[PDB]
Design a protein around this motif. Structure first.
Motif, PDB file in Angstrom:
ATOM      1  N   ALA A   1       0.866  -1.198   0.000  1.00  0.00           N
ATOM      2  CA  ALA A   1       0.000   0.000   0.000  1.00  0.00           C
ATOM      3  C   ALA A   1       0.879   1.216   0.000  1.00  0.00           C
ATOM      4  O   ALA A   1       1.982   1.195   0.544  1.00  0.00           O
ATOM      5  N   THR A   2       0.381   2.283  -0.608  1.00  0.00           N
ATOM      6  CA  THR A   2       1.122   3.540  -0.585  1.00  0.00           C
ATOM      7  C   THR A   2       0.429   4.528   0.327  1.00  0.00           C
ATOM      8  O   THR A   2      -0.786   4.641   0.344  1.00  0.00           O
ATOM      9  N   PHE A   3       1.246   5.214   1.123  1.00  0.00           N
ATOM     10  CA  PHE A   3       0.806   6.295   1.972  1.00  0.00           C
ATOM     11  C   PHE A   3       1.557   7.540   1.529  1.00  0.00           C
ATOM     12  O   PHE A   3       2.778   7.526   1.486  1.00  0.00           O
ATOM     13  N   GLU A   4       0.828   8.600   1.222  1.00  0.00           N
ATOM     14  CA  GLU A   4       1.434   9.905   0.998  1.00  0.00           C
ATOM     15  C   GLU A   4       1.266  10.686   2.303  1.00  0.00           C
ATOM     16  O   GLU A   4       0.140  10.852   2.804  1.00  0.00           O
ATOM     17  N   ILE A   5       2.366  11.187   2.833  1.00  0.00           N
ATOM     18  CA  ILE A   5       2.368  11.910   4.105  1.00  0.00           C
ATOM     19  C   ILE A   5       2.719  13.359   3.766  1.00  0.00           C
ATOM     20  O   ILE A   5       3.772  13.621   3.189  1.00  0.00           O
ATOM     21  N   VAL A   6       1.821  14.275   4.088  1.00  0.00           N
ATOM     22  CA  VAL A   6       1.888  15.676   3.634  1.00  0.00           C
ATOM     23  C   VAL A   6       1.910  16.585   4.855  1.00  0.00           C
ATOM     24  O   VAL A   6       1.047  16.471   5.744  1.00  0.00           O
ATOM     25  N   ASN A   7       2.895  17.467   4.927  1.00  0.00           N
ATOM     26  CA  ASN A   7       2.953  18.433   6.006  1.00  0.00           C
ATOM     27  C   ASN A   7       2.363  19.765   5.539  1.00  0.00           C
ATOM     28  O   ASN A   7       3.037  20.525   4.818  1.00  0.00           O
ATOM     29  N   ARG A   8       1.112  20.051   5.880  1.00  0.00           N
ATOM     30  CA  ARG A   8       0.506  21.365   5.635  1.00  0.00           C
ATOM     31  C   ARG A   8       0.695  22.374   6.773  1.00  0.00           C
ATOM     32  O   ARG A   8       0.236  23.513   6.690  1.00  0.00           O
TER      33      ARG A   8
END
Length: 206
Positions: A1-8
């Protein structure tokens, strides 16, 4: 599985990903404001967690310290982090289904959204100002809002006997973030997704 982790968030965070006895992918990375980190998590992973760490210093060997969520002083986490940590939790491909949740059982440091990027279920979010509103006895000096088990170490807060109720402290977390676990025996806020879904974890979503 792919997880995109985004720091907003407007501040740098150091993302971490672990299953408690091993790193997931690289295990951790610095994310400046706006940056995205894509990781691959093996199918069948049970008991995975993703979190943010704040106010970290690391040397060139990847060794150092963070004020929230420190995982034994490593940039690349192999173990879980020190509270307070808002947690994205997941178990993948469990009898054909994925299970996701957000938890405040180990306190709160950074607001979070955890959503699928593929079809067939909804996401969950805890984005309230828990640190600002944190009761005085739960405030962590390094930042964040501790859970009551971490602070007081009682059977009731830690649910040690397997029998415990909600408390004044758990109700605070629940009032601000209804869709996150507030204590061990809280009514589950787990979301069931199709097996082998992909996901995005966004820090400071709003």
């Amino acid at each position: 599985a792919t997880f995109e982790i985004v720091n907003r968030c407007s501040y740098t965070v150091w993302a971490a990903a672990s299953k408690g006895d091993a790193a997931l992918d690289a295990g951790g990375r610095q994310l400046n404001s706006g940056e995205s980190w894509t990781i691959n998590v093996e199918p069948g992973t049970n008991g995975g967690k993703i979190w943010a760490r704040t106010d970290c210093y690391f040397d060139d060997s990847g060794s150092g310290i963070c004020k929230t969520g420190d995982c034994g002083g490593l940039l690349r986490c192999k173990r879980f982090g020190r509270p307070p940590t808002t947690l994205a939790e997941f178990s993948l491909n469990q009898y054909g289904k994925d299970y996701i949740d957000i938890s405040n059982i180990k306190g709160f440091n950074v607001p979070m959204n955890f959503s699928p990027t593929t079809r067939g279920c909804r996401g969950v979010r805890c984005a309230a100002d828990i640190v600002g509103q944190c009761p005085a006895k739960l405030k962590a000096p390094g930042g964040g809002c501790n859970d009551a088990c971490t602070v007081f170490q009682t059977s009731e807060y830690c649910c040690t006997t397997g029998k415990c109720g909600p408390t004044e402290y758990s109700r605070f977390f629940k009032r601000l973030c209804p869709d996150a676990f507030s204590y061990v025996l809280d009514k589950p806020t787990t979301v069931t997704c199709p097996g082998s879904s992909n996901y995005r974890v966004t820090f400071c979503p709003t």
